[model samples]
Target: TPDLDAIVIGAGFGGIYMLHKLRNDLGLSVRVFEKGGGVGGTWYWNKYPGAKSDTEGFVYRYSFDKELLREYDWTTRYLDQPDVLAYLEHVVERYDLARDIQLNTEVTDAIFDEETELWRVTTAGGETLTARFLVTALGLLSRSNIPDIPGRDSFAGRLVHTNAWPEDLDITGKRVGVIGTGSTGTQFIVAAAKMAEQLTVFQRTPQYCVPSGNGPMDPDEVARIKQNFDSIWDQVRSSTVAFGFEESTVEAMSVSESERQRVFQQAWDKGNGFRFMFGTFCDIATNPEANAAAAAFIRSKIAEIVKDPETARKLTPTDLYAKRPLCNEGYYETYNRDNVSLVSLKETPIEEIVPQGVRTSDGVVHELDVLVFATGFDAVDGNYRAMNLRGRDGRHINEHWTEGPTSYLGVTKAGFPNMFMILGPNGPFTNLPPSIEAQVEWISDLIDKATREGLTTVEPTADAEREWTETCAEIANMTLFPKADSWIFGANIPGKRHAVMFYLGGLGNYRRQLADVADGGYRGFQLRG
Candidate 1:
């Protein structure tokens, strides 16, 4: 019937979990399409050196399977790309999900057939299939953003994007130049600095960073985690950031200056970006005084770590520490290395990419053997906007989102009937796995209800979508995050409409709203056969 009950795109955590829930648990026929050759969505593509989950390994995985939780193990506090990929593969094999998964097959178009009430999905391989429902598990940061710089292709050496890192390409002994200093760039810079003959870092914006404190996991700690798995997941699902740490409720200004510094130091020494941001003080994101205090501490750290005053000034971020907090091991200490150098783009802008290396406005041609662009992603709506998705009355998704991306409950849009988006626009901003699972489970439940009720279509009302978007914007305005030129508000991408793309409201609160909607017979949504 309609080829299959549902078709899922992108085989990352969201897609894989959606497939299992629909096909196995709900007894619906489901097929997963992945552009990558294997499972592990984000992990599959991002194999850049030093790439690892910022979330601790303990809670970065699925909590649905009790056995897997008990038996599976991770050596480090954070799992690298390979380990994460392997874990996804293990889950697929264990659950027999590979059989229904079509790898290296990209969905080119998805058009909703009004009369048939099915989605006509076309792939790059020139095949069209029909499904009653279409679910996009496209990740939050899957779409890599490489800036349009002059003479980019003219680079003579290996120019690569961290999003698509070549496995065999070795940077060892090569003069490497890296552009952008986001999370990925910093991680790559830290690793490349050790091996590259000469490492030059180009920084457009300086980031406030904390130590990661990443290392081998303790056996006793792992045992305790395994025993406390139930409570761990419960807390994760209910927490604000869902980073497996207790978020502090104390305001930075509420305490004395000495006490505030001590608390900040404790979190800094323990290491984690989210921990430092949310676990140390509750009002750092909302209260300007608190944010400034935290920012000052990091600036002080930069001043202490960098030997050269110039480099320290370049590294110190003058803006509010409201951007996504970065955590890394030896990121500041790495600058002390003889082989490392920092180029502040603010002082000297990049004119173009010359064949030798990057040329700045000061007419300095920083020669390089290898160039890396850690430019980050277009974020939440990039992947969706890239594809041709026509909804009711042949209205394209781009046309629907002419102003900016918006969705009801961050799951379904108004015009796109029977289509679901996991980690969609205005979704919860938290440690991703738990968020992914939350959306997946909720989507599956909705689908189950639709099938049981013999519903042909389900989509949110335009009012509901508008209200949700406004709510997200309002919550974002409450915090200092929207003030910064950051990816959180789609500011990183050039000319992209800078708007609030996440629910600043915590994960626990978002889940409650979802539950309330379902409990109220899916209010604000129109369902019909």
Candidate 2:
């Protein structure tokens, strides 16, 4: 392949924005390679039964161009996969990005040439391309992980994974069994209960899910929001969690018992994950008493919703209140159905998958027509670490991240010059699109400046990388985020190092730090002429 100024890995939201900035704004030749046949990276592939975005529809979008915003209309508060995919397709068509993007192409390797200061990128189809810079727009949650259970291949019935759902999978009247009760399983269970003849949910861990009071979009409400998009986004950009919600000044312990119940109930009735956690109290995630109160409220709600006490006990989460806040529709009500059955993995351990069905340790052979694994991804740095990336002085990406990912500002690492990552380790943990846009725009500015100044390469200093890693750790330790065995801490995948994989600092704070770094002449970076 011909040499280009830059190469982008994935044609998702980040890749689309990066390509536009490089090709349209900076007038640099850029090519985007996507594994999927089209855009909407995550939405394109994850077409499972209950596939929908966790974030609100209007807010979970690119905030780059006002014209695009004005032109498009979202029909629901919480958008589904098809609608999200259509929005992405509209973006590709609107910008005419197809010609520049190489669809159905996967980047297999990226090796940096130390002498030439360029990257030699290899594709899975045995094509090689050279580029001045290589940018990975690989989404954080791209790689799906399935448990290595015994005799999985022996099952004669249909098998499915939520992340890579088959295009033609139809479990309408079949007796379905879903394993793992994360967001994917929880959402799927609600819809499956109404459709399936019998639904068995195998849950290893119970989740605290807030009700997502989803409804049809009111045109007047949408018009009002559209008109005030600027102000709304400004609030999001300036806020800590990047949501259009208010932070509470009232303390959980300070309020009267009756008043506390009233406040918590109000937020719960309003419906939103972050709102229930942070909007109810400022220190819910930090203060133990505050977190316990919130946890108790959620448990009470589960008891109220689920008819049986044993079922409620199985579903109730007694740990930290909102460690990975999940919002769903009719999730609690689904448990009341006679067709639905909850199999706690703790009690009835899965021994092996038989030809007919799954056999538990208790010797109960539960017959299943369809077996689904709602198992989540090896999130955060999983995709990047898995790639065949050779950096400066033959340093491998996996070697550098063997302990944990260490990056300066979560954009560039010490050994990787002229390489940038979006939503990388220790990056902003907020509403995804805004965070992605911020990283892309920031990296673009650096690239443009490097071009203007005749700089050949740029990378973060080793000292800066270490300092930044320490900073991330310090900030993360200050919160209750590390308390849970979540993928946020790289705990889902066995043998993966357990550490904070996201920036604990808020979006506004992170933006300020990035700006300050740039203002100080990119103090922590090493720029070569």
Best by lDDT: 1
Candidate 1 has its poorest 10 consecutive residues by lDDT at: 395-404
TM-scores for candidates 1 onward, in order: 0.99, 0.98
Error of 2 at 255 (Å): 1.7
Residue-level lDDT tens digits of model 2 in 207-253 = 99888878899999899989999998998887778867766877899
Give the poorly placed runs of model 2, Cα more than 4 Å off.
none
lDDT of 1 by residue, 1-529 (tens): 6999999999999999999999999999989999888889889988888999899999999999999999999889999999999999999999899999999999989999998989989999999999999999988999989899988988999999998888889999999999999899999999999899999999989999999999999989999999999999999989999999999989899899999999999999999999999999999999999999999999999999999998888998999989998999999999999999999988998999989999999999999999999999989999899989999889989997877898999999999999999999999999988888889999999999999999999999999999999999999999999998988888888899988899989889999999999999999999997
User: How much is the lDDT of residue 106 in candidate 1?
Assistant: 91
Q: Global lDDT of each model?
A: 0.93, 0.87
Candidate 1 RMSD to the correct structure: 0.9
Model 2 CA lDDT for position 105: 91
Q: Model 2 residue 49 lDDT?
A: 81
For model 2 the local lDDT of residue 155 reads 88
